[PDB]
RNA sequence: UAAUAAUGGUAUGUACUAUGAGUAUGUAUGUAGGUUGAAAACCCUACCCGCUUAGGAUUGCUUAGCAGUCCUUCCCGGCA
């Protein structure tokens, strides 16, 4: 009975702790990206001769 | 020019505000979040319940704002409970001002505070044409 | 323009509006009047309840189910009850927008929507310097 | 200066400091807020509870110094309780200042700590001429 | 297939209270079956969903950068 009472006393903290803090940690990070392009010109010289 | 207040009780769930000048008035905010699968899919439901109470004694008999005539105090309590999915918070916000104006039209600008009711009052929804 | 909402059930106490296009959304505004005697003078007490409920289907998971199927609809509810005497609506109007401005900082501007408070918030009372 | 303490158990109505070097020494503050009704006036009362403890082995026998005298360690606790209406804090302070001087002339300068009481000790009230 | 139960739970509405979401109550306990009883159906079967175990998928392919998944097992949970 004492063990069960201690159980009932602690798991309020268990609920206040574990699921909430784990989901708080989980609610972080995700994939995203950005991109762009150009038609930049690269020139190589050739002598007129 | 509005006097601010400062917290009284600090908790992971509840924050109690109150004016140092007038301890009668207070504003507190407690919120509970629940881990829910409505359509066999997980949802982030957060239920933020807000209370704002002011003890304002204002019977003030006609034209008697004259002298040291104290009146007993009366309650003015405002209860708001907002619950919804955190993922849809952006549109949940959008619904929120619709609730503002809807109440404002029928009550703030309307005459529902006296206890009357107008079914013909303009009531509008969140979505647009 | 936002789509007008029309009543479905009218009563001396409760009026329930709904959108003709989609009647799932509702706005039920109930009233509840009682007689309160405090300062050897009966006062007119109104307990004005307002419930605004909107329904928006799913958080819409990407791909997979985006062909012809929708995950069951969720519920978004905002409940507001306004109490106090009817002899002093003028101050009740003033505090209501103050409550509106108070809730906005936590919800509309702050991150209280996602479920996280802010003890360093800046809220003010209805009264003014 | 002296050694500052850091709080080790914070709560909305319970804050306890203790010295990091000597964790035995403590200072606890408890505030109990309650609303009390007096004649035609609702009153907001607060009780200030303050406990200061210093654990200390008191007397060195005569005037030596040595290792094999580790005498029992005893306690020195000073508890102070303040109660009064919130808005009367302005005058609440002054009599507290009076309470300081009032016990000063009896204990700090008098032999009240020994166990003796002086009927002709100078005692004054908060009010002044 | 299954009964005794401790059925201390949860969610959703009701009346009171409320400077409280506290009190009590109805309803249901992911989806359907067997079953007396304590019909708030205790429990087992089957099907879905989310955990956990440690294994894998062409592991490379790509004139573009892929891809934020998939299958099995351990696996506990979505009324006790």
D95-100 long-range Cβ contacts below 8 angstroms, 24+ apart: D95/D126, D98/D124, D98/D125, D98/D126
Q: Which residues contact C6 (CB under 8 A, 6 or more apart)?
A: B123, C17, C18, C19, C20
Nucleotide of closest approach to C34 (CA, C1'): E16
- C-alpha to C-alpha distance for B111 and B117, rounded to whole angstroms: 7
d(CA D99, CA D83): 13
Mutate to test the interface with B, among C26, C84, C116 (most CBs of B within 10 A): C84
Retrieve residue B91's tokens: 């549109």
- Burial of B61-98, coded b for 16+ CB within 10 Å and e otherwise, reads eeeeeeeeeebebbebebbbbbbbbbbbbebbbebbeb
State the smallest CA–CA distance between residue C20 and chain B in angstroms. 11
Best B23, B24, B55, B70 member to test D by mutation, with max D CBs in 10 Å, is B23
Two tokens at C75? 């519920």
Q: Which helix (H) or strand (E) holds C77?
A: strand C76-82
Distances (CA, A) of C13 to B80, B97, B116, C90: 20, 24, 9, 23
Helix or strand run (H / E) with residue D111: none
Nucleotide closest to residue B73 (CA–C1')? E19
**Looking at chain B, which residue has its C-alpha nearest residue C24?**
B125
Cα–Cα nearest to B123, from C86, C50, C49: C50
Report the candidate in B80, B85, B14 with the shortest Cα–Cα distance to residue B46.
Answer: B85
Nucleic chain E contacts, Cβ below 7 Å: A 4, 8, 31, 33, 35; B 14, 18, 24, 26, 28, 30, 34, 37, 40-42, 49, 51, 53, 55, 75, 77, 79, 83; C 47, 63, 77, 81; D 35, 42, 44
Pairs of CB atoms within 8 A across B/C: 242
DSSP β-ladder status, C14-18 and D26-38:
unpaired
Query: Could you give the CA distance from residue D47 to residue D33 in angstroms, rounded to a whole number?
Result: 7
Selection from D122, D103, C103 nearest residue B79 by Cα: C103
Question: CB of B47 within 8 A of CB of C77?
Answer: no
Q: What are the structure tokens assigned to B78, written together?
A: 């405002």
Dihedral over alpha carbons D48, D4, D15, C121 (to 10 degrees): 100
Structural tokens at position C44: 């007119």
**CA distances in angstroms from D109 to A9, D54, D101, D105, D118, listed in the order given:** 51, 21, 10, 5, 11
Rounded distance, CA B107 to CA B121, Å? 10
Chain B residues touching A12 at Cβ < 8 A: none
Cβ-Cβ contacts under 8 Å, A16 against chain B: 12
Q: How far is the CA of B89 from the C1' of E70 (A)?
A: 32
Cβ D76 vs Cβ D53: under 8 Å: yes
Alpha-carbon distance C95 to C103, whole Å? 12
Which nucleotides on strand E sit less than 7 A from a protein beta carbon?
A: 8, 10-13, 18-21, 30, 48-50, 65-66, 68, 78
Instruction: Give strand pairing partners of B4.
Output: C124
Task: Report residue D47: phi and psi, to 5°.
Answer: -115, 125
Nucleotide nearest to B18 (CA to C1'): E19
> Which residues, in sequence order, are CB contacts of B100 under 8 Å at separation 6+?
C100
> Two tokens at B76?
């003015």
Cβ distance of C86 and B41 shorter than 8 Å: no
Kind plus residue range of the DSSP H or E element containing B62: none
Using the Cα atoms of residue B26, residue C106, residue C93 and residue B100 in order, give the sign of their dihedral: negative
Give the list of residues 6+ apart from residue C19 with CB closer than 8 angstroms, or none. Answer: B125, B127, C3, C4, C5, C6, C25
- Give me B20's structure tokens: 């140092």
Pairing of strands D14-18, D6-11: antiparallel
**Alpha carbon D36 to chain centroid, angstroms:** 25
Residue indicated by tokens 């609920």: A15
Q: What is the resolution of this structure in A?
A: 3.1
Residue B54, SS3 per DSSP: strand
CA B80/CA C51 separation, integer angstroms: 10
Do B51 and B79 meet the contact criterion of CB atoms below 8 Å apart?
Answer: yes
Minimal C-alpha gap between D82 and chain B (Å): 18
Residues C13, C81: Cα–Cα separation, whole Å? 14
Q: Which nucleotide is nearest to B45 (CA to C1')?
A: E11
Beta strands in chain D (DSSP E): 6-11, 14-18, 26-38, 41-56, 74-85
Burial class of residue D55 in the structure, from the number of CB atoms within 10 Å of its CB (0-12 exposed, 13-18 middle, 19+ buried)? middle
Identify the contact set of chain D against chain B, taking CB-CB distances under 8 A: 12-13, 40-42, 44, 86
Tokens of A40: 């930049």
Structure-determination technique:
cryo-EM
Q: Look at B39 and C52 and tell me if their CB atoms are within 8 Å.
A: no
Q: How many angstroms is C1' of E48 away from CA of C29?
A: 40
Q: How far is CA D46 from CA B42, B120, D35, D94, in A?
A: 46, 51, 8, 17
């Amino acid at each position: 009975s004492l063990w069960l009472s201690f159980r009932y006393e602690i798991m309020p903290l268990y609920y206040q702790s574990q699921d909430v803090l784990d989901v708080i940690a989980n609610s972080t990070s995700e994939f995203m990206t950005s991109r762009d392009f150009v038609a930049k010109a690269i020139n190589i010289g050739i002598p007129l001769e | 020019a509005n006097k601010p207040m400062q917290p009284i009780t600090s908790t992971a769930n509840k924050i109690v505000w109150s004016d140092p000048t007038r301890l009668s008035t207070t504003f507190s905010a407690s919120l509970l979040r629940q881990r829910v699968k409505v359509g066999i899919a997980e949802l982030n439901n957060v239920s933020g319940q807000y209370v704002s109470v002011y003890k304002r004694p204002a019977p003030k008999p006609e034209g008697c704002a004259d002298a040291c005539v104290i009146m007993p105090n009366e309650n003015q309590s405002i209860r708001t409970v907002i619950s919804g999915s955190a993922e849809n918070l952006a549109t949940l916000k959008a619904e929120w001002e619709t609730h503002k104006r809807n109440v404002d039209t029928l009550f703030a600008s309307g005459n529902a505070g006296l206890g009357f009711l107008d079914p013909t009052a303009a009531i509008v929804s969140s979505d647009t044409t």
